[PDB]
Symmetry: C4
Subunit: 32 residues, 4 copies
């Protein structure tokens, strides 16, 4: 169970590569 919690944290820390998206959104804004 403690392992499963660790796994879910690793998936969130996966999910937060959001910060890919934000870099791309920033680039689009510089151009437009």
């Amino acid at each position: 169970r403690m392992k499963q919690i660790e796994d879910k944290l690793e998936e969130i820390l996966x999910k937060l590569x959001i910060e890919x998206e934000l870099a791309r959104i920033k680039k689009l804004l510089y151009e437009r």
Copy 2:
């Protein structure tokens, strides 16, 4: 404490559906 931690992790992985706003922001930028 373990059950409450598991509950919070699932709610965070809820909160990250952020991916609503970001999808809309990306669409708006494609169109501009």
Copy 3:
């Protein structure tokens, strides 16, 4: 310690109200 972990999850789930910011960023884009 398990309590401290729960506390940090609650702070992150604080931090993610990011999704305030994203709603505001979306609104600015609709206007510009």
Copy 4:
């Protein structure tokens, strides 16, 4: 497992400094 979980939570609360991109996105939008 407890130490590794604590390590991941601090790294996530690192990853959320996202608040780089979002600050820049907000500034760009104010100027447009």
